Amino acid sequence: MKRTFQPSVLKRNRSHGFRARMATKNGRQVLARRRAKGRARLTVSK
Amino acid sequence: AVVKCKPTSPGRRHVVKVVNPELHKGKPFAPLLEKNSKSGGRNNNGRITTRHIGGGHKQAYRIVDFKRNKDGIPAVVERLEYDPNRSANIALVLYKDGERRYILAPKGLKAGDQIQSGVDAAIKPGNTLPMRNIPVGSTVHNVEMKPGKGGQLARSAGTYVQIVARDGAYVTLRLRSGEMRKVEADCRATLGEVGNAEHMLRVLGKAGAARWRGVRPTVRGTAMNPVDHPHGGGEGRNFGKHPVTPWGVQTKGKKTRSNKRTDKFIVRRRS
RNA sequence: GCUUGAGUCUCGUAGAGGGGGGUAGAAUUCCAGGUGUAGCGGUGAAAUGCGUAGAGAUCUGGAGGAAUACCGGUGGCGAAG
RNA sequence: AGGACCGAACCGACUAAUGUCGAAAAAUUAGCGGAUGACUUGUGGCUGGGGGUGAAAGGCCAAUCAAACCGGGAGAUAGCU
RNA sequence: GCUCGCCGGAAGACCAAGGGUUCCUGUCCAACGUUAAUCGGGGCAGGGUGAGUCGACCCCUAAGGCGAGGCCGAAAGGCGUAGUCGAUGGGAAACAGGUUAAUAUUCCUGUACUUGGUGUUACUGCGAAGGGGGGACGGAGAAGGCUAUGUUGGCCGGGCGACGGUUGUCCCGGUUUAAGCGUGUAGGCUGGUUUUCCAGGCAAAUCCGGAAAAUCAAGGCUGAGGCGUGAUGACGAGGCACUACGGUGCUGAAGCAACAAAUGCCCUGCUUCCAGGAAAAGCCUCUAAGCAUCAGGUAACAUCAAAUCGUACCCCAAACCGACACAGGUGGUCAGGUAGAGAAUACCAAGGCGCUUGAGAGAACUCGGGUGAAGGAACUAGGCAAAAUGGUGCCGUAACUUCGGGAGAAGGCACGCUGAUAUGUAGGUGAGGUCCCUCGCGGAUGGAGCUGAAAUCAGUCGAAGAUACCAGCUGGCUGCAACUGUUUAUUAAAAACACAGCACUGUGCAAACACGAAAGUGGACGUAUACGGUGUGACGCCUGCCCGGUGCCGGAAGGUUAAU
RNA sequence: AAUUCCUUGUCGGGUAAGUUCCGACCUGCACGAAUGGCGUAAUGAUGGCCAGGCUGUCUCCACCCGAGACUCAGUGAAAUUGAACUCGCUGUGAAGAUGCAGUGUACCCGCGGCAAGACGGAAAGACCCCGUGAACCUUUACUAUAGCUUGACACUGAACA
RNA sequence: CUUUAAUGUUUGAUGUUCUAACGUUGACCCGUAAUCCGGGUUGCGGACAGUGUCUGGUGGGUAGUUUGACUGGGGCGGUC
RNA sequence: CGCGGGGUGGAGCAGCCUGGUAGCUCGUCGGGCUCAUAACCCGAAGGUCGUCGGUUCAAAUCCGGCCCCCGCAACCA
C-alpha cells in the first residue's frame, strides 16, 4: 500500500508555517501557550 | 439537420445531432473575448450551494450585449455561430462604422443580409427598436424590463414574447408560460422568433453528454440514507411520506412566489 | 408519305382543383367590472350538476380556437378519395 | 465516428491458495475487468464536526466515524464491577 | 581475477519531490546490520557542491488567498474594489572534448549566443497605468518529407587460430562529430501594393476595422532536415613506454555509400467532428497630457556588468512515506540487437547485481509444480481448483433482431527447411548518364546497387512444424438489470446506485432554491426549447377504478378567533 | 415467480434416479400497471441448470523435483503462566475430577510427531435480560425553536370619491 | 323604546391621485485607469416593499427527553 | 394457550347501545294483467330471537357456561 504521508515543504509550510499561524487571531492564541511551554518548534520551520 | 447515427454501439445508437453548415466552421472572434471561470457551484464560503454542476468542457465568455443602442446605424450580418453559453445560435453583425457585435440571431436571418437599429427602422426580422413603434399582435423577442437594462426575457432557443395591447403607458404582454405581465412601453426589443428552434428535438443519449456538459447526476433521495435526506431507509423500497424537498419544503405543488413588489405588474397568472 | 387517331402553338372561358401566406363577421366559452335576483339548466318525468361565497339573464371590454349562415342548385371541378 | 472489439504500461480488486504472533497494522502468486474514456494521474487551492462530501455505503474526513481529534468543564455520574 | 547464473521498457542510466553529508578517503570493531565481519549507508578525523547561457529568485497572470477606504455583523469577524501575491502556465540567451578519490550544459581549451548601462559618430522627432496585433491554445484520425538509431557492405588494423576444416562468399573490432552562422528545400498559410474618406476603438491616431477606386499578379511570413562552415580541430582501435603493480605520459590508420525506419521533429500543422476548446506581460506599433539648442529612438563600434540561492549522493529505493536495511506504494525523460504486429514475451548488448545466515539430511507432514494407467464429475454447497481451448490467411457461420449486430459463433484446411518460376518476384527506394531551364536544396528521363512480403510446383526431415515463452473453452434454456460505468479502501462489485429518456410541479429575474445572524454570492454574467425538487429508469405495447383519510392548491360568505 | 404459507402442489420434458431447473394448468396465505406491469437484441469477473470438450477433483492416490520441517554452528523472540512430586476408570460433589474416596496401572528423563482434555490462549460475550445508562433515526409521542406566513404598531405622508 | 331622516362632530374599512420618506442587482457623470461603494441628475415604482416589537397558525428542517413494573428469561397476554 | 365482534323467518340485514310496542327488500302460497311464463301490483302466513339457568315490573335486551365463524400466532439467538 501507501502510508498517508507524502511530504511537501511547500504544502506544509503554507498551512503550518510561521506566517500561517500569525495570519489569524487563533494562530497567535495557540502560539501563546507554545511560548509558555517554550517548545523550540514554535512553528515547524528551518 | 436532425439525424440519428446507425447503431455501431449502444450510446452512439441514441444520439440526436443538430448540424447546420450555415454555422461558422472556425473559431470565435478573438478580439471580443473575455475569460470565464467555471465556479463549480461554490459560494464565497466554498460550499456547493447548488447540485448538478461539475466538470463541463471549457466554456469561455463570448461577449453578447443586449442594449442595442447603435441608433441610426445600418448593419450587416457577417456570419453565424453557435455558443454553448446560450442554447440558440449567435449572429456576428458587422456595422457600417467599423464595429462588430455578437447578438441573437432570429429565424429567417441569413448571413450577408442587412439588419439595423435606431428609430428609423422597419418591421424586419432582426431590427431592434422601442416597443412604442411595434404594432399590435407582434411576435417579439429579447425584450427588456426597464429601458436601457439591455435584455431580460426570450433569450433561449425557439422563444418569443407575445405582445397583446398597448393601453396608456403599459403594454399588455403574454409570457411563454402564460403569465400576462406588464412593462413600460419604452423597452427596446427585436422583432422575430429566436432561431435554432430545432434544439429542442436534440436528445443526449449518453451519460457523457451530461457530464462533459457540466451536469452531475441526480441521486434519488429514497435511495439515500434517512440521516442525510428527508427520505431514505426502509428495507422494502417504500415512500410512505409526503413528497418534499431535501429541505422540508413540499414539492409537486407549492406556490413559492413571494416578492410582493412585482404583484402590481403581475396581472394574469399561469392557470 | 397522307389523314378522319393523337399531340402542340396563337386568342379567349368557367371553376369548392391543389399548396403557401394574411384577413373579416356572427356565434359559443372563459376572465374582469356595472345592474339585478331566487331560481337556472333538463326531460316523457325526475335527478346529478350550477346557485344566497350571489348563477342564469343583460350591457361593455378583452383574450382565443374551430368551422364558414343566407348565395347553394340530381350546380361546378377532378383520375379517385 | 464509436461511453467500439483484443490486449500491455496505467487504475482497480471478481475467484482460489499462501499468510493470520505473516514479508506486510489486507499483501504476494497464477488466472482476470476497463484501457480514446462518466478515463487515469502529478503539482497547486477551496469546501470542516451536527458541519463538509457523497454515480448514496449511513461509506469518507491522516491505520480512528450512526457523528474525528487536542485542551478544558471533569477527580462528570454510576442503585453497577 | 577466471568461470556460472539473473534482470535487461530493468533489479539500468539521469532529474523533480522529499530527505539532509547517507557521496569520497584514511582508520577502527564493543555498540548499528537478525550470522561471522580487517566489510559497509556504523564510530572518529579530513576533504568535496566553482554558473551571464541550468532551475529558482525575478517579470507577468490563472484557481484562489490577503485586501487601504467601503458594505455588514454583540466583540472576535465575514465578503469584496483598487491593488498586492501566487505555477503545474508563458517570457532572453551553450554545446562538444578532456580532467578528479568525490563535482562539472558551472572548471580548463576551442567555438558561439543574449538582455541592459555609460560613452562616440552619423541621422531621425519621441513619449503612458490608454488602443490595436501578437502571445493564444480542443479531441481523434490519416498522409508526405526526415532524424535519433540500427543493419549490410566498402575501407583500415589484427588474426588465419590449443579436436576435423579455415588466405577465403573467413572472423572480430572501429567506422564518432553539437550550439551557432550561411543557404533557407520539402511543406503549410495568405491576394499584395497605392490613393481617399469615416457617427468606430472612454479622447486622439499614420496602428487596426469598414466602404469605394487603382495597378499587377505575386510579394511576404513561416519552416524539421540535408548541404557547406564550425573542424589541415577534437576524438578515435591498436601500438609505443614506466609500475607506487591502482594508472599515467606519448602517438595515431579509416572516419563514407546504401537501405530500413520511430510514439521524436515540420505539427503552437491539415482534414473532420463535436462536448465549440485561459489570462497578463515580454515584443512590435499608434498617440494623449506634453517636451523639441534638449530629452529619447534606430544603426554601427569600444568597453563593462550579468548579482543571490540550490549544485555532493539517493531520486520505481537499506537514503521518500511505511516504527525496521520491510516481497508494497512514488511522477517525467531516454530506451539497442534477433524473433515477433507490438513498449507483450524469451534470450543477449550497455550497465548493475546473486538478494547480509550457511553447511548436511532428503522422514511424516506443508507449500510452489511436473507426470500419470482404465474411467471421465461418480467429488462437492457448486465443474471451485487444475487441465485444456489458445496464432495468421482463407473457407464457412444458426435462433433472433432495434436489421448495428449475433460472431473470431460453431466447426475446419494449410503451416518447418531447400531449390526453382527469378544467380531473391510483385512492390519500395534510387546514384550516374541525357535533355531543358524563369540556374537552384530544380523538373522530366533513366536505370546500377540495396532491401524485401507472398503465391505455386517439386523434394526432403521428424511421432509432433503457432512445435518454445506468448496465447479465448464452447453450445443451449432462463431470472434480473438495459448496456460503459460507480460503491461498502480493511470479509458483500450485485438484482443495489448511477444512466439517457419520460412525467408532474415549482420559477417571470432583486427568480425559485441554498450557504451565510448580515452584506454578498452560487444559480448565471443563464433567463421558460432555461433552471430547481421529486419519482421511475433504453427501446417496444400500454399505464385502469377511488378525492373517502392525509397532504397541497383555489374560493373565501359565515362560525370560532391573538395582539391592538 | 427474487412473490405461493400449506408443499417435494400438478402435468409434461430432461435423468436409471430430479426438494433445484424449463414450459404450462390457476386453488394469487399475501403480483400489479412510475414505490411502473409484461417482453427484450446487444451486454454481463452476475444467479440457477444441462450437455459436449478436457483434465487427479473423485473411485484411491503413486512417484519425483525444489522452499521448510530433522541435524549442526552462530543470533535469539512469542502469546501465556497461582503453585506442582502434572496416570486411567467408577462414584461422589458449586451438579462432566490430573489432585477426594475405592481401585487398577505405571522405571527416571528427552527427541520427532499427531491433536481428545487441562470446560486450553486471545476479545471484562457483539446474543438474552437488567440499568428509572448512552446514542442517533422516526412520527398524527410531550414541550420549544429555525424558517415561512398573517395582522396591529413604528419608519409612515398629503388630498378627494 | 323602536323604526328612520337632515346636520354638526368623532373614528374605521376600501377606490383613486400625487411627491418629498423609502426602495432602485434602470441609464449616465465625477471621485477614479476601479463590474464594490458614496454622492450628484434623471427615469421608474410607491407610503407599497423591507426590517424591528407583539402575536396566531404551520412546523422532525433543528434540539432536549419520555417511552412502567411484577413476570418460574423476554415478548404477546393478564393484572396492579 | 389469548383477545375483539357476531350468532335474529327460505336468504341478507334491523331492533340491543339507553329495557315494556318485533321492521325492510327479495322469496313462498294465491289472485289479476298477456294465449303462457317472467316482470309488475296487492293480501296473508312464516321469528322456540342457538340452548339452559339466574335475577330485577317481563328476557330479543343484563349476566354466566357450551358450540360455531373471521383476523392475528406457530415468536428472539
- Own/partner contacts of B164-172, CB < 8 Å, gap of 24 or more, are B164/B136, B164/B137, B165/B136, B166/B131, B166/B132, B166/B136, B171/B131, B172/B267
Beta strands in B70-195 (DSSP E): 74-81, 90-95, 100-104, 114-116, 128-130, 139-141, 161-163, 170-174, 180-184, 188-191
- Is residue B109 within 8 Å of residue B127, measured between CB atoms? no
Neighbours of B185 (CB within 10 A): 18
B168, B165, B199, B170: which is closest to B184 by C-alpha?
B170
Q: Which fold has domain A1-46?
A: Helix Hairpins (1.10.287)
Chain B residues 100-159 within 7 Å (CB) of strand E: 100, 145, 151-159
- Is residue B61 within 8 Å of residue B35, measured between CB atoms? yes
Are B107 and B5 in a shared domain? yes
From B96, B113, B130, give the residue that closes a domain. Answer: B113
Are B146 and B129 in a shared domain? yes
Q: Which amino acid is at B269?
A: R
Query: For chain C, which bases have at least one atom within 7 A of a protein Cβ?
Result: 23, 31, 62-64
> Which helix or strand (DSSP H or E) is residue A9 part of?
helix A9-16
User: Which residue range(s) make up the domain with B149?
Assistant: 117-194
Domains in chain B, number: 3
Are B232 and B270 in a shared domain? yes
CA-to-C1' span, B228 to D67 (A): 12
B189, B190, B170: which is closest to B180 by C-alpha?
B170
The experimental method is cryo-EM
Chain B residues 180-239 within 7 Å (CB) of strand F: 222, 226-227, 230, 233, 237-239
CA-to-C1' span, A8 to E308 (A): 24
C-alpha cell at B98: 467599423
- Is residue B171 within 8 Å of residue B165, measured between CB atoms? yes
Sheet holding B74-81, edge to edge: B100-104, B90-95, B74-81, B114-116
CATH number, domain at B34?
2.40.50.140
From B139, B173, B194, give the residue that closes a domain. Answer: B194
From B93, B113, B133, give the residue that closes a domain. Answer: B113
Are B167 and B241 in a shared domain? no
The total number of residues shown for chain B amounts to 271
Query: For chain F, which bases have at least one atom within 7 A of a protein Cβ?
Result: 35-36, 41-42, 136-139, 146, 148-149
Are B17 and B42 in a shared domain? yes
**Cβ of residue B169 near strand G, that is under 7 Å?**
yes
- Residue B167's nearest nucleotide, by CA–C1', is C62
Distance from the first to the final alpha carbon of chain B: 36
**Cβ of residue B165 near strand C, that is under 7 Å?**
yes
Kindly give, in sequence order, each residue whose CB lies less than 8 Å from that of residue A43, ignoring residues fewer than 6 positions away. A16, A17, A18, A20, A21, A31
**Cβ of residue B138 near strand C, that is under 7 Å?**
no
The total number of residues shown for chain A amounts to 46
Instruction: State the Cα torsion B141-B146-B148-B153 to the nearest 10°.
Output: -30
- Coil, helix or strand for B268? strand
Identify the burial level of B168 via C-beta atoms within 10 angstroms of its C-beta, where 0-12 means exposed, 13-18 middle and 19 or more buried: exposed
Q: How far apart are CA B135 and CA B125, in angstroms?
A: 14
Please report where in the chains the cell 451536469 appears, as a residue.
Answer: B215
Q: How far apart are CA B142 and CA B161, in angstroms?
A: 8
**Cβ of residue B110 near strand G, that is under 7 Å?**
no
> Which helix or strand (DSSP H or E) is residue B2 part of?
strand B2-4
**Cβ of residue B162 near strand C, that is under 7 Å?**
yes
Q: How far apart are CA B233 and CA B218, in angstroms?
A: 18
Neighbours of A41 (CB within 10 A): 7
> Which helix or strand (DSSP H or E) is residue A19 part of?
helix A18-21
- Residue B28's nearest nucleotide, by CA–C1', is E276
CA-to-C1' span, B20 to E90 (A): 37
Q: How far apart are CA B220 and CA B243, in angstroms?
A: 12
Q: Give the phi and the psi of residue B18 in degrees, each rounded to 5.
A: -120, 90
**Cβ of residue B259 near strand E, that is under 7 Å?**
yes
Are B129 and B97 in a shared domain? no
Neighbours of A24 (CB within 10 A): 10
- Residue B241's nearest nucleotide, by CA–C1', is E551
Q: What is the resolution of this structure in A?
A: 4.3
C-alpha cell at B267: 396581472
Query: CA B96 → CA B99, B129, B237, distances in Å?
Result: 7, 18, 66
